């Protein structure tokens, strides 16, 4: 947001099912797999 200097989530697109009725009185970054165990397939050369 150019106005608040903050990364904010986008607003919600309307939906016809969620229409208003009579009564109305009223961001972390995706972490990288630094310590995540990589996939170890059995496709080594020793096994072969």
């Amino acid at each position: 947001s150019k106005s608040t200097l903050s990364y904010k989530y986008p607003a919600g697109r309307p939906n016809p099912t969620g229409f208003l009725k009579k009564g109305d009185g009223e961001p972390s970054p995706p972490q990288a797999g630094a310590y995540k165990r990589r996939e170890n397939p059995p496709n080594t050369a020793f096994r072969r």
Binding site: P16, F19, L20, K22
Partner: protein
């Protein structure tokens, strides 16, 4: 301080806003080049309620023009005062609206909000002290009505404490400019009952009455009616823009006006209005301003206040005048014809005054009335809705955008409850 951000939605809004910014700009002596060329230092003090400084001493308005099918913007962008706007405050979609409340609210409007909201915020923060919003509507078409309300609900939640006005032009009783008008009206009203603080209602038909019954005009054009609407809109923010011995902020005008949170529909009227021949006979004094404004003809809406009762009222006089006459006049009225005023409110008028009249006059006024005759707009619209919604006419165009059906009845029941609130408080 006290800044105001202004919206113009739809074809009607994009054209009322043309005359509005032409009126206000001349009131502060700024050219279509945006440069200030007035005389007094009074214009410069509160210029920032509508404009922003720019390099070289230009003053661009704090407006936002939004519309589907930007064809009508190409007009104002080419007019005399079309060179003042910032080009980034021109939001538009390549497709058309279609006088269809659905796609103006669900499909196409939604694809523009992501851009519109970046526009409203970037110039809501430039305001050191935001006062409120104001919009100009048209309850007939799709862009003004559909995108208008959808814009409001986004604004109502982002800035709940600030104030939101709507100078919505409502449909006409006897000649309808569109056929789908009653559908588009209620579905918008169902938004204004909950997402609006004040809502002045206007009718193009009653505007015609004032236009040749009082002004006695010959060839009235929409350019002349907008010279009327822009006169009352400019008549509100005088206390914000000009000093006065009894000022009246925009917020204090509401608290003195609506007793209950739902009755935020008003009716307005301007004074004085004379022909080119009458200015020779009639005199300009407070007793004249106070009878032409209290009459049942200057009411710019097509609702006769004599078929109801006034809850409260208001008046924004302009020009150095005697602040007693204004006090005893608005008193004398409530006493004479006591049948039209409620009893559990002893003194039901508010009176402000500004030392600075319009640019060309010496005295002027402006009127805001909260009557129970406003229900007449809602009876007439309620039947025109039910006469064709019970038959399911013109409706396959609305379900085409995945709209439901209860969204019609809920929008209607909400009205037929609002029409009863206006009657409890009318003990006749």
């Amino acid at each position: 301080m006290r800044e105001i951000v202004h919206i113009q939605g739809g074809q009607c809004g994009n054209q009322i806003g043309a005359k509005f910014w032409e009126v206000v700009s001349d009131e502060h002596g700024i050219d279509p080049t945006g440069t200030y060329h007035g005389d007094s230092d009074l214009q410069l003090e509160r210029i920032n309620v509508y404009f922003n400084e720019a390099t070289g001493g230009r003053y661009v308005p704090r407006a936002i023009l939004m519309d589907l099918e930007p064809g009508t913007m190409d007009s104002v962008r080419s007019g005399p005062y079309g060179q003042i706007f910032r080009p980034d405050n021109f939001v538009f979609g390549q497709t058309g609206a279609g006088n269809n409340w659905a796609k103006g609210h669900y499909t196409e409007g939604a694809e523009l909000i992501d851009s519109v909201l970046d526009v409203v915020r970037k110039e809501a923060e430039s305001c050191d002290c935001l006062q409120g919003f104001q919009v100009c509507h048209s309850l007939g078409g799709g862009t003004g009505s559909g995108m208008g309300t959808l814009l409001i609900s986004k604004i109502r939640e982002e800035y709940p404490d600030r104030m939101m006005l709507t100078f919505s032009v409502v449909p006409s009783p006897k000649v309808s400019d569109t056929v789908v008008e009653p559908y588009n009206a209620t579905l918008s009203v169902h938004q204004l009952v909950e997402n609006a603080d004040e809502c002045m209602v206007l009718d193009n038909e009653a505007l015609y009455d004032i236009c040749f019954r009082t002004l006695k005009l010959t060839t009235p054009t929409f350019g002349d009616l907008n010279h009327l609407i822009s006169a009352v809109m400019s008549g509100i923010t005088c206390c914000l823009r000009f000093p006065g011995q009894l000022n009246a902020d925009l917020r204090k005008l509401a608290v003195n006006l609506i007793p209950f949170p739902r009755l935020h529909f008003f009716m307005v009227g301007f004074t004085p209005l004379t022909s080119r021949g009458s200015q020779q006979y009639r005199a300009l004094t407070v007793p004249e301003l106070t009878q032409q404004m209290w009459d049942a003809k200057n009411m710019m809406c097509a609702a006769d206040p004599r078929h109801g009762r006034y809850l409260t009222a208001s008046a924004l006089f302009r020009g150095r005048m005697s602040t007693k006459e204004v006090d005893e006049q608005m008193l004398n009225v409530q006493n004479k014809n006591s049948s039209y005023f409620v009893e559990w409110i002893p003194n039901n008028v508010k009176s402000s005054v500004c030392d600075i009249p319009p640019k060309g006059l010496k005295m002027s006024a402006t009127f805001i009335g909260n009557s129970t005759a406003i229900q007449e707009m809602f009876k007439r619209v309620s039947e025109q809705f039910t006469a064709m919604f019970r038959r399911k006419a013109f409706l396959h165009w609305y379900t085409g955008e995945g709209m439901d059906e209860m969204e019609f009845t809920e929008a209607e029941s909400n009205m037929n409850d609002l029409v009863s609130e206006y009657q409890q408080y009318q003990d006749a």
